Structures are given as structure tokens and as C-alpha cells.
């Protein structure tokens, strides 16, 4: 049995799948965090090696035989490649783990799970990113620069607009579009501080990007219960997300438009659980972005969700990096959830 493995990590979820020669998924094991910014490359190496061994036991596979390849689909933030270093520390500490390594990106590992010839992903999790891989080599992207330089339409951004808007309102630097009450109270309560000064501590001493972006869930709840300000912030995240697509539009190979689905857009990230709250902003940004840019027309799009971990894409790409091609059941890996054709 020749085994190929993929890893999903870098963000909040971490996971390993192992795949056989024939593309049959052998086992899945969940793991501890592999965000290399919060944890070092020492721990990263440790949790990856545990994860894979546990999965090997689970699959009924020879514990001593090294993986043919291991495809690591990781949300970089900075591809400052210490991904190079991760591979080096990996083959240094555990030489029996795998014969070969591939570090890719979360976007490329997702795309790889859904289609055999590239496509388009829109990511909205704690951060955001939009990426494209054409049927030929060509790649292209918009805005995966993290929290200090963009992330428009992410959980961070939704959270940041939320506090930015109350700060500016009280200050009289800008008038809010709708009442400040619910969010102002949600804020103080979530961060457990009485006033605006209390919020500074969480920004510059503490700073917990994870806690901060968590605030998005409270805006989502408030929006669901009809608080206009909350509904507003989710509309604008819809636009920002829609704009990422508009941005990459000129770079898309025309054949990707010309099917029954039309342009398939893979939607990765938990913010998409609030799709109903993003829908209008998203539809708007696209609708105004096809007047300004292209009479060279795509007629429709459909949105898709993954049904297996991006680790499956990882495994796929890890095999591709060596000799092999892993068979893939692309119908099973992703499903349609929304469709729209411009009228």
C-alpha cells in the first residue's frame, strides 16, 4: 500500500487525510492548531507528526512505512517561506514521516479539492482572500494581506468596522448610518470593559486577533435579530467580498464562464454561514462591477461549498508534486448552494 496524505492547517481548523493509490480516503484525524504565528515551527512539526501517525493507525496502514508524499495546505499570511523551514525541521525530526513534501496555500488546496483544472475561490474566515487558477499555468489574486493591510469582508473586518463606527460616532468624527446602541453594548460586554478606554487595552497590550474576530459572531446574531447597524455592516462585507471577484475578473479564462453552472465560485470560510446576511451587498458589488468593466459577458455564477477538508486537495497536490496523479471524485467534494444569472 502506497499512501498519500494531505494536511489542512494555518488557521483555526487542522486536519490530516490519507488517500490510497486509487483515491479512496483511508482515514481522517483532527488535530491541534498549526497557526505558526501563535505557535512556533517546533510545535507545528510536533502536531503534524502526531496527526499523521494517529491517522495511520486509524487507517489500518503499516505504521512504519513512510508516506509517499504529504501535501500541506496552509493559510500562510506570510509566504515568507519559513514553509521552507517547516519542511527542513520535518525531515530533520522525523525522517520516517514522508518521502516528499509540498507546502501550498489554503486557496490552492481548496481549489484542488473541487476541480481538476483550477477555478476561483473566495475566502472569508478570520481573514479573506480571493484566488484564481486558470486551466493553463496562470494565477491571479486579490487581497490576502492579513489584518494590518486589508482582509476586507473577513470576520476581523466585520469586527473592526463594528468598533470603528461606534468610536467615530461618540467622537463625532463621523455619523453612523444607523443607531449605535446594540453594537456599543455588544462591544463592551464581549470585551468585558465599561468604556472606550477599556477597548484600547485589547488592541495594543493584550491583542488577541482570534478574540477580536470572534466579535463577528455577535454582529451576526444581532443582524439576525434585525438590528439595522449590524445588518448594515454585513451588507458592506458583502460588497467587499463581491469586489474581490470584480477585481480578478479580467484575468479569468473565458471558458470558465461558458457552462451550465456558469462561473463556479468556491466559498471557503465560516463567514459564509451568514450568506443570507451577505447576499445583497455581494449581488450589488457584482451588478455594478459588470457595467463598469465587461460587456464581454459571463451570464451567471453559482456558489459552492466544500464537502471534504482542503486536506484532500493537499493530498492531491502532494502526489502531483512527485510522479503521481490521485484520482478524485470531484462531484462528491463540492456542492452548489446558490445560483444567480444577471438579468
Ligand X SMILES: Nc1ncnc2c1ncn2[C@@H]1O[C@H](COP(=O)(O)OP(=O)(O)O)[C@@H](O)[C@H]1O
Ligand Y SMILES: OC[C@H]1O[C@H](O)[C@H](O)[C@@H](O)[C@@H]1O
DSSP, collapsed to helix, strand or coil, labels residue 303 as: strand
Q: How far is the CB of 40 from its own copies (least distance, A)?
A: 12
Residue in 217, 231, 320, 321 binding ligand X, rule: CB under 6 A: 217
Residue 53 counted as an annotated binding residue: no
Residue 145 counted as an annotated binding residue: yes
Residue closer to ligand Y by CB (options 9, 76) is 76
Report how far residue 24's alpha carbon sits from residue 96's, in angstroms, rounded to the nearest whole number.
23
What φ, ψ does residue 254 adopt, rounded to 5°?
A: -50, -30
Report how far residue 111's alpha carbon sits from residue 115's, in angstroms, rounded to the nearest whole number.
6
3-state secondary structure 197-246: HHHHHHHHCCCCHHHHHHHHHHHHHHHHCCCHHHHHHHHHHHHHHHHHHH
Report how far residue 145's alpha carbon sits from residue 165's, in angstroms, rounded to the nearest whole number.
23
Count the residues of the shown chain that bind ligand Y, applying the rule CB under 6 A: 16
Instruction: Show contacts with ligand X in window 96-155 (CB under 6 A).
Output: 125-126, 155
300 is an interface residue for ligand X by CB under 6 A? no
Q: Residue 155: which of ligand X, ligand Y, its own copies, none does it interact with, CB under 5 to 8 A by kind?
A: ligand X
**Of 63-71, 160-168, 210-218, 324-332, which segment contacts ligand X by CB under 6 A?**
210-218
Residue in 35, 115, 129, 274 binding ligand Y, rule: CB under 6 A: 129
Cell of 308: 471534504
Residue nearest ligand X (C-beta atom) = 125
Residue closer to ligand X by CB (options 215, 301) is 215
Please provide the distance, in angstroms rounded to a whole number, between the alpha carbons at the two ends of the chain: 53
Residue in 144, 222, 262, 313 binding ligand Y, rule: CB under 6 A: 144
Residue 281 counted as an annotated binding residue: no
Instruction: Show contacts with ligand X in window 229-268 (CB under 6 A).
Output: none
The helix (run of H) or strand (run of E) holding residue 185 is helix 181-191
Alpha helices in 225-341 (DSSP H): 228-248, 275-289, 311-321, 330-333
Q: How far is the CB of 9 from ligand X (least distance, A)?
A: 9
**Contact positions toward ligand Y, by CB under 6 A?**
11, 75-78, 106-107, 123, 125, 127-129, 144-146, 151
**Contact positions toward ligand X, by CB under 6 A?**
11-13, 125-126, 155, 213-214, 216-217, 220, 269-271, 273-274
Amino acid at each position: 500500500a502506497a499512501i498519500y496524505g494531505g494536511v489542512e492547517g494555518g488557521g483555526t481548523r487542522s486536519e490530516v487525510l490519507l488517500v490510497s493509490e486509487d483515491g479512496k480516503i483511508l482515514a481522517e484525524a483532527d488535530g491541534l492548531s498549526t497557526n505558526h504565528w501563535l505557535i512556533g515551527t517546533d510545535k507545528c512539526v510536533e502536531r503534524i507528526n502526531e496527526m499523521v501517525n494517529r491517522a495511520k493507525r486509524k487507517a489500518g496502514v503499516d505504521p512504519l512505512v513512510p508516506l509517499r508524499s504529504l501535501g500541506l495546505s496552509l493559510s500562510g499570511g506570510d509566504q515568507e517561506d519559513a514553509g521552507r523551514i517547516l519542511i527542513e525541521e520535518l525531515r530533520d525530526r522525523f525522517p520516517y514521516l514522508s518521502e516528499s513534501y509540498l507546502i501550498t496555500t489554503d486557496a490552492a488546496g481548496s481549489i484542488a479539492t473541487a476541480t481538476p483544472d483550477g477555478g476561483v475561490v473566495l475566502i472569508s474566515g478570520t481573514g479573506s482572500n480571493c484566488r484564481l487558477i486558470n486551466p493553463d499555468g496562470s494565477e491571479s489574486g486579490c487581497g490576502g494581506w492579513g489584518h494590518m493591510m486589508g482582509d476586507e469582508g473577513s470576520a476581523y473586518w466585520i469586527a473592526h468596522q463594528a468598533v470603528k463606527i461606534v468610536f467615530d460616532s461618540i467622537d463625532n468624527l463621523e455619523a453612523a448610518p444607523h443607531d449605535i446602541g446594540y453594537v456599543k453594548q455588544a462591544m463592551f460586554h464581549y470585551f468585558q470593559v465599561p468604556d472606550r478606554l477599556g477597548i484600547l487595552t485589547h488592541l495594543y497590550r493584550d491583542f488577541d486577533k482570534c478574540r477580536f474576530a470572534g466579535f463577528c459572531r455577535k454582529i451576526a446574531e444581532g443582524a439576525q435579530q434585525g438590528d439595522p447597524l449590524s445588518r448594515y455592516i454585513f451588507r458592506k462585507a458583502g460588497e467587499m467580498l463581491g469586489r474581490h471577484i470584480v477585481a480578478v475578473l479580467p484575468e479569468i479564462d473565458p471558458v470558465l464562464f461558458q457552462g451550465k453552472i456558469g462561473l463556479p465560485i468556491l466559498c471557503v470560510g465560516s463567514v459564509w454561514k451568514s450568506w443570507e446576511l451577505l447576499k445583497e451587498g455581494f449581488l450589488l458589488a457584482l451588478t455594478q462591477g459588470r457595467e463598469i468593466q465587461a460587456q464581454n459577458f459571463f451570464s451567471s455564477f453559482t456558489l459552492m461549498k466544500l464537502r471534504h477538508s482542503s486536506a484532500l486537495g493537499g493530498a492531491s497536490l502532494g502526489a502531483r508534486h512527485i510522479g503521481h496523479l490521485l484520482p478524485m471524485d470531484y462531484s462528491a467534494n463540492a456542492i452548489a448552494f446558490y445560483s444567480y444569472t444577471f438579468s
